Amino acid sequence: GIVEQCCTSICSLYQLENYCN
Amino acid sequence: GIVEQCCTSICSLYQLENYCN
Amino acid sequence: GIVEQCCTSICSLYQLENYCN
Amino acid sequence: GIVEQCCTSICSLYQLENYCN
Amino acid sequence: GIVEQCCTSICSLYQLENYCN
Amino acid sequence: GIVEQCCTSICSLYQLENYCN
Amino acid sequence: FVNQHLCGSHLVEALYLVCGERGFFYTPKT
Amino acid sequence: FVNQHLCGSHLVEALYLVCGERGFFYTP
Amino acid sequence: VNQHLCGSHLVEALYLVCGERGFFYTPK
Amino acid sequence: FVNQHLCGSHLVEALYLVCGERGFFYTP
Amino acid sequence: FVNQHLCGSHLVEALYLVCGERGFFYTP
Amino acid sequence: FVNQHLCGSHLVEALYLVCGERGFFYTPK
Ligand SMILES: [Cl-]
Ligand SMILES: [Cl-]
Ligand code: NA
Ligand code: NA
Ligand code: NA
Ligand code: NA
Ligand code: NA
Ligand code: NA
Ligand SMILES: [Zn+2]
Ligand SMILES: [Zn+2]
């Protein structure tokens, strides 16, 4: 999930956009 | 400047990146 | 919904809870 | 105090409410 | 209060410091 | 830089002000 | 509208705190 | 897990900006 | 709502300005 | 400790939301 | 009302995210 | 854990407050 992915290492804008509805 | 451009109408990610170094 | 309701007047935490999953 | 209680474990809004005036 | 004092016009750091304990 | 100076020990306002234009 | 954009930022923070493990959906659409 | 709680606050702020009118779901 | 949004930023500013002194926030 | 400093910033935003018109003392 | 100041706070947060390692400049 | 990134977000908020009309550059690198 986003917490596991993006709280452990920094997510780029593109990686964050993966989690948009 | 960024305040004039972005404080009435919402700036997109692309527009915001105009103000990066 | 939430914008029309909670950006035009202050919503209580109870009102905000209605928008939870 | 609040830091000892709520920075070492997550405090809910109910626990935080105890600190209101 | 602070809202009347600091939400109509920006408060300086000195003005904000008034509310420190 | 500011991250090295201020991300383990808390920087004061005076210390932060050195990074202003 | 930037006013709504700014309000929404605060709304999602509020929902994050209020909803807890329930989570929430948000859209600024509207 | 306070670390994740704090991170999540920043994540939802980031998703709010990035997702725009698409919106997003979030759960901690 | 304007005053509500302002207050959120006010408390963040007081937190930084006041440091270990802490602060008193009342909208009264 | 900066970790506590950052935590506290989020605490006061949460207190602002929860306490509403009551307000609050923040006395770390 | 302090709308410009509030807008600026959110703009700086957005620039921080968007600009990443490039960094940014903020002038009100 | 994304601690340095989170710290920086709060640092730029602090600079925004303290620098006032002076503004600031933020340069992580
Ligand atoms: Cl705002
Ligand atoms: Cl944080
Ligand atoms: Na306006
Ligand atoms: Na005082
Ligand atoms: Na230290
Ligand atoms: Na307005
Ligand atoms: Na702020
Ligand atoms: Na902000
Ligand atoms: Zn705001
Ligand atoms: Zn944070």
Curated annotation (Swiss-Prot), chains A, B, C, D, E, F:
Disulfide bonds join 6-11. This is Insulin A chain. It comes from Homo sapiens (Human). The lineage of its organism: Eukaryota, Metazoa, Chordata, Craniata, Vertebrata. The gene is INS. The chain holds residues 90 to 110 of 110 of the full protein.
From Swiss-Prot, chains H, J, K:
Changing residue 24 to S: In HPRI; Los-Angeles. It comes from the Eukaryota. Changing residue 10 to D: In HPRI; Providence. Changing residue 22 to Q: In MODY10; reduces binding affinity to INSR; reduces biological activity; reduces folding properties. This is Insulin B chain. The chain holds residues 25 to 52 of 110 of the full protein.
